[PDB]
Symmetry: D2
Subunit: 356 residues, 4 copies
């Protein structure tokens, strides 16, 4: 690349990327017992040949109770690892995208239904399960009060993150994103609205960061040095008394000190009474606040739908990388059109080059 920043090659730690465009993680709710299915090969295989330099696989539960739904991906046994490795192998052969995976634990937001099947969370008798959380504070008022995690629970989930990370590297993923955003377990520890613990893992900012930073360090220590481990954050909670940009800056700096390779900057998701001023680029200001206070790449996301918008965000130095989600659902070849509009050569596998 030469004409635009968006499609110029970029170095993410030890990982050489074809460009600065990222496909954000998007849950598909199409797995069986956490095992990726034909849908994921069709869905992720398309994103891998889209032209983006990095594709982040949807939130993947580190243990059965960490899945958002009974239909989410998991990475806690050999059968799930083999299915994901097959998809990574397809991406290696046909696309120019590096494959990353988002390791997650849904915390108090687990055991829920597909978004297109509205209703209350699955009760244990309906095939659901009781959730875990830093504190016994509910997100869904209609379901069971979450189990407050003991010190041994913290070590169990942390080891599950480590084991899922080791499986991911073995399956061929070149980067890992820890899901500390959108109201799931790590975010639940970070924010005072959900963390009311009275030990050293709740209260002050340093206490609320303590367990998420342990997970990051433990994951980084269990992987080879060339593996990239990043953190997706919710920089603010959009609710009174929640996470502030100053605290998220501090957390992002602490993540960098422990070897995080990038910060993926999102917002919201912690409480139902949030008020989010949704609009084009409504989270770009938060990405710029993070980028100006860390020395690792920052990914912006949120209603980024046009190449000229994406390139301005990079050129004006609001972020280092552009992530898109819904624009890629509408047009999975968004990078093709975007590269042409910016004057760069679009990527296309040989099978598709008669349309180029």
């Amino acid at each position: 690349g030469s004409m635009s920043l968006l499609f110029s090659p970029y170095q993410l730690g030890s990982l050489s990327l074809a460009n600065r465009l990222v496909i954000a993680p998007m849950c598909q709710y199409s797995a069986v017992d956490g095992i990726a299915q034909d849908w994921h090969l069709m869905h992720l295989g398309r994103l891998a040949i889209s032209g983006a330099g990095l594709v982040i696989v949807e939130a993947t539960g580190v243990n059965p109770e960490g899945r958002i739904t009974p239909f989410c991906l998991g990475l806690y046994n050999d059968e799930q690892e083999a299915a994901l490795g097959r998809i990574v192998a397809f991406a290696r052969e046909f696309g120019q995208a590096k494959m990353a995976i988002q390791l997650a634990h849904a915390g108090r937001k687990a055991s829920t239904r597909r978004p297109w099947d509205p209703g209350s969370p699955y009760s244990p008798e309906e095939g659901g399960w009781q959730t875990w959380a830093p504190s016994a504070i509910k997100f869904y008022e209609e379901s069971l009060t979450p189990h407050p995690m003991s010190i041994e629970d913290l070590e169990t989930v942390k080891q599950d993150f480590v084991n899922s990370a080791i499986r991911a590297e073995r399956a061929g993923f070149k980067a890992i994103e820890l899901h500390g955003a959108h109201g799931y377990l790590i975010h639940q520890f970070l924010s005072p609205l959900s963390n009311q613990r009275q030990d050293q893992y709740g209260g002050s900012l340093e206490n609320r960061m303590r367990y998420p930073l342990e997970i990051l360090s433990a994951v980084k220590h269990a992987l080879s040095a060339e593996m990239v481990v990043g953190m997706r954050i919710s920089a603010v909670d959009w609710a009174p008394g929640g996470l502030t940009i100053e605290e998220s800056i501090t957390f992002s700096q602490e993540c960098e000190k422990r070897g995080a390779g990038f910060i993926h900057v999102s917002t919201g998701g912690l409480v139902a009474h949030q008020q989010i001023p949704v609009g084009p680029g409504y989270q770009v200001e938060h990405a710029q606040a993070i980028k100006q206070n860390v020395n690792i790449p920052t990914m912006a996301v949120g209603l980024i739908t046009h190449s000229a918008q994406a390139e301005t965000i990079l050129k004006s130095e609001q972020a280092d990388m552009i992530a898109i989600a819904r624009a890629a659902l509408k047009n999975p070849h968004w990078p093709w059109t975007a590269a042409l509009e910016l004057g760069d050569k679009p990527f296309a596998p040989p099978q598709y080059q008669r349309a180029r």
Copy 2:
């Protein structure tokens, strides 16, 4: 549908379609021994969820020597049939498209390379094969002169079409398109530039139509009556002394009498010295000529790239159905954008409805 013709439900014989939009067949050159691969599940699965009412699988050889390349799909053994049936099953579960397959024999254009691997056709020592044709007339001057087919050769290929058709119906395909276009075997019989036979299968128009009409009747007789069997034609050869629109009208009328369910109207492909006046809708006039002389649905194709162009073709009654190929490679969700521009509700699988 209610706002446009393009996205109003349509009946193709006994086959109820969600709309009048067709994805034209597009060779992928990604098979192994004729067996569909992961690429085809990714490629065809996406087209099946695109919103189109009908997806026509790429040209599939009825026997090993009928493949265009060593990397084309085949439908002459159980392993190939099972792999295609798996893709059809994916379409039945997630998409609203009916699945069709184009049964083909490449004739004198067989045993060639991938289009992105330029070079001469594969010689027999390179893993290629000598081709079959109605007459010993070469398309590629650098390769072997094709073997002119005897009467028993005609019956062998005809039975191969029948067997592939039976396999296709068993694999779940609801429609079959016989490939009588683009310079392959059936087209080679139809045109005087390639058919110089001295028996009852060459010479007059009725002789040149005789063998293609036999294949159609044999295929239609070997399948259940609710199966749709259509014919893709090259209405003209774009070369002096070749097929004329009057002859293609006659052949299309003869196809209807034999039970053909639709006519898919393309042009060209027979000889290398063709001069094609390519441009937006350059084959639509040929589709209107066929439509005005037959009582079965006519599909138009050829540089149809915009919804307003497609809808005008239907409203002005130049054709009954719209086929797209390259526009679907560039944007596999073309029907999504097209439906919105025409004021109709776009189709999207539930996994993607948060982008709708």
Copy 3:
């Protein structure tokens, strides 16, 4: 031009046009006593530099009572002629469009309000006037029954058309379009729903065509031979018992025999109880019916909004020229984008070439 038909130079009679794109006439309702104002210089000057090869000025009344509204253009005195000549001179200096004007008489549809001021027609005491028509049959039930025109009335209006044509030629217009469409005076004579006369100007088709053909012949005879005089028609009435495409074909053939230079093919407008199947290219079929039966250029119009749609209409030979109206109101530089989409050089005046 060389890449598309739409932007290839075209010969309209003795007029050499830059392309085949026409801006259809569009009433602006912004005149004072029929005199063009600053609005018309802003509006028509923009259309003249748009890139279209031909701009047709809105329906211009040949006498005060022939105006649709008190705010319509007129061409029956020196002050109106001078104002229009100033606009034609602006077009000559900056644009590549030839200037045409639509000469009209509203007949029984005259003396009405601006479309954005809904209400009954202006009564004579409100500043309106009683209308003239072939028969005493109302379009608006709330207004005065129109005067049925006597023999001297026919001669008077015909002479008004002649005088306006002479003024138009003197002001610099290179083509004239007679408004025989959309339910106005000439159309009122053509259709049996509005013409119930008992003399030689009503009854048979030959009688209903008689007065419109006299106007055409008289206009053609009064102008220099290189002036182009065309006819805009309503090919059908979209009402039971109205004009048929067969009758409009005959009238269009009679127009050519009198020296008409083109047929502009529209539909509707005669009666309020019409049912029009509106949609993209819904009048293109009617244009093709006329084009196949005359040897003068045919202009298609009606929801033509995209370059690929326009080029398909020309390439498939449904019409000889493409007319647009509402697409040019939405984007007055529609030809700029259209030429780029078709691969041709877009026209731009030197003041705007830093955007090219």
Copy 4:
């Protein structure tokens, strides 16, 4: 407006604007003796009905020698004022834009040719004139060395700015933009590359700002209090030893103290050996630097071509208003399309509402 910031009503000093979209000044080189012509009515009248809330008329010379070219607008006599007043009156009748004018003196860049007539500046005997500048330093090496301005020259040109401002207010303009950018006279004083004076108007930053700040204060004092007077700046020179963003921040703050109503942030234009990193939004970072240090509205400009890009600039608080130029030449109804893409009601005069 309510759905987007770009099309929400905005307060610019005492001026109520329909939205936050600005049409940037664009020289047309179509005047005669500084008098606006039919071209300017066509061009500026279209911009006034485009939907933008503010239209800035092209750089207008405060005296004959301050014009960039012999074909630029001037505002130093009654005939020029009356012609501009007739355009403002057209805008007031049909559009929703408030009208502003850019008052300028080209300094050492005066007496040049139309951009589409490349060549050396007009010499005095060819109808050109010798230029004035803070120092006898040439921009064009082929022309006469500019006159270094004496104390009376400063007072004379300052009075010319005052007189033109009074004429502009009398002609109906509601805002004035002083042209302190793009290498013209005021910019020539600000930058050390062009200002080498040894008196109190050169040397230190305080000295280089002294004369531009006098012009602003004198213009502000001669107008009514409700008139808006802004400053267009070149925030950096893109050349070694030129203006820095720190210096432009200081100048912008000094402008605010003396009553400037807004800062319009551009860059470059001072020296020919500049190297500008052109790209989408390449001047937005400079606008944000100004916005973060002043309490008056800041306008961003420079390759802003898409609504999502423009809205992101506002929502992420890089600027308060969006200015477009070349995008408005390509599509003068850019605000119409932009409002629809952002979900707001587009503005259209009643004559055009049948296209909405």
